[PDB]
C-alpha cells in the first residue's frame, strides 16, 4: 500500500512523506493505507485528497 | 607578481578570432595556433595586450591562470618570427648524423638508428658537433631538439657526451 500510494502521490508532484504529513495535519481524515489505495480504482478522488493536503501544507 | 599575470604587449600585426570552449585561433603572417582552455578561464585580450585576471583564488585560477595568459603571447611570437634552439653531441667519433632529410646515425655501438624529421622545422648545421635548429613553435622545436639530443648518449668516464646548449658531460668514479 505504501509503495502504491508513493507512486500515485509522485504522479501529482508530492512525495509520500509530505502527503502523509499534510493529511495528518489537514484535519486528520483517518484513512488506512489499504483504503487510500483507491488511487488504483478512482484516481480523481485521490487527487482531491492530495489537493487538500497540499492546500494545508503551504 | 605571478608568472603569467602581466600585460603582454604585441606588435599588433597579427589576427585573432574567438569561439566557444576557449577556442582562440591566433594567426598572422605565418603561424596559426589554437589552444583551448577550460571555460571557467576568463578571457581578457585586447588588440595586442592581454590583461587577463584570475576568476578565483583557488588553484584552478590562482595557479593555472599564470600558465595560460603567458603562453598566449607565445603564439604571437610563433606567429610572427619563429624560434631557434641549440645542442651539442661532443664525442671522439660523433660525426655520424644525417646528410640532409632523414637522420641516419651509427653510434659506434653496432646498431644504427634512422629517423625522419617532421613538418614545421628547418635544420641548417653543416658541422654536427654543434647543433642549431629553427622553426615556428617553441614546443615543436623543443621536441625536435629533444629528438636529436636522444640520438647520442654520454659516458661518465670519458669527458665526451651529448649536452644541451653550453652544457658539460657527466663524470663518475671510473677506474
Amino acid at each position: 500500500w505504501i509503495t502504491r500510494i508513493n507512486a500515485a502521490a509522485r504522479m501529482n508532484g508530492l512525495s509520500y512523506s509530505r502527503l502523509m504529513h499534510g493529511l495528518k495535519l489537514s484535519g486528520i481524515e483517518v484513512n488506512r493505507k489499504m483504503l487510500a489505495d483507491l488511487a488504483v480504482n478512482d484516481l480523481t478522488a485521490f487527487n482531491q485528497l492530495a489537493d487538500a493536503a497540499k492546500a494545508q501544507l503551504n | 607578481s605571478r608568472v603569467g599575470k602581466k600585460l603582454l604587449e604585441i606588435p599588433s600585426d597579427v589576427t585573432v578570432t574567438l569561439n566557444d570552449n576557449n577556442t582562440v585561433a591566433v594567426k598572422g603572417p605565418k603561424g596559426e595556433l589554437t589552444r583551448t582552455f577550460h571555460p571557467d578561464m576568463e578571457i581578457k585580450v585586447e588588440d595586442n595586450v592581454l590583461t587577463v585576471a584570475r576568476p578565483s583564488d583557488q588553484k584552478e585560477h590562482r595557479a593555472l591562470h599564470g600558465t595560460t595568459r603567458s603562453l598566449l603571447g607565445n603564439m604571437v611570437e610563433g606567429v610572427s618570427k619563429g624560434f631557434e634552439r641549440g645542442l651539442e653531441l661532443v664525442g671522439v667519433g660523433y660525426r655520424a648524423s644525417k646528410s640532409g632529410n632523414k637522420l641516419v646515425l651509427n653510434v659506434g655501438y653496432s646498431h644504427p638508428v634512422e629517423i625522419v624529421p617532421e613538418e614545421g622545422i628547418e635544420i641548417e648545421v653543416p658541422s654536427q658537433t654543434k647543433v642549431v635548429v629553427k622553426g615556428t613553435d617553441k614546443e615543436r622545436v623543443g621536441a625536435i631538439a629533444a629528438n636529436i639530443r636522444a640520438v647520442r648518449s654520454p659516458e661518465p668516464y670519458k669527458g665526451k657526451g651529448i649536452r644541451y646548449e653550453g652544457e658539460v658531460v657527466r663524470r663518475k668514479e671510473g677506474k
Binding site: 509503495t3 502504491r4 507512486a7 500515485a8 509522485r10 489505495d37 480504482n41 484516481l43 | -
Partner: protein
C-alpha cells in the same frame, strides 16, 4: 482485498539520452522505471515495467579519477584466469556493455529480474531502429 494485475496491462516506450549524465545517477532511475515502480498498479510478482531505449550511450560521464581507476574483473573458471579491463577501454570499445552491467547490477535476482532485463535497449550513437513502436521522450525526473 486490493487488486493485483494479470496480463491486462500496456507497456509504453521511452527514450532517454545519456549525454552528460553520470553513470549511477541515471542507472538508478532507469532501473526504477524498468521495475515499474512509477505507476500505481505496481505488483511484486508480475512484470509491470516499460521499455527503455538509451541513445548516445558513449558520452557517459564519471566523476573523479574513476575513468582511469575503476576496473572490471571477470573469471573464466580456469586456474589463474582473471581478466581485467579499465573503464576507459570499456567506454571507448564496448560502451553499451558498461551501461548494461551497471543497470543489471541494480535489478532483483531470479527469473523475474532476468525477464525484466530483456526490456532494455542500449545504442551507441544517436539513432535507433524502433520506429513502429512510437517512442515517447522522457526526461530524468531525479
Amino acid at each position: 482485498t486490493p487488486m493485483a494485475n494479470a496480463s491486462t496491462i500496456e507497456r509504453k516506450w521511452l527514450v532517454v539520452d545519456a549525454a552528460g549524465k553520470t553513470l549511477g545517477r541515471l542507472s538508478s532511475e532507469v532501473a526504477a522505471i524498468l521495475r515499474g515502480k512509477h505507476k500505481p498498479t505496481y505488483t511484486p510478482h508480475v512484470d509491470t515495467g516499460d521499455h527503455v531505449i538509451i541513445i548516445n550511450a558513449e558520452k557517459i560521464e564519471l566523476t573523479g579519477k574513476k575513468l582511469t581507476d575503476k576496473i572490471y574483473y571477470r573469471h573464466t573458471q580456469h586456474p589463474g584466469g582473471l581478466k581485467s579491463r579499465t573503464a576507459l577501454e570499456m567506454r571507448t570499445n564496448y560502451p553499451e556493455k558498461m551501461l548494461e552491467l551497471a543497470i543489471k547490477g541494480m535489478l532483483p535476482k531470479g527469473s523475474l529480474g532476468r525477464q525484466m532485463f530483456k526490456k532494455l535497449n542500449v545504442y551507441r550513437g544517436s539513432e535507433h531502429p524502433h520506429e513502429a513502436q512510437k517512442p515517447e521522450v522522457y526526461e530524468l525526473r531525479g
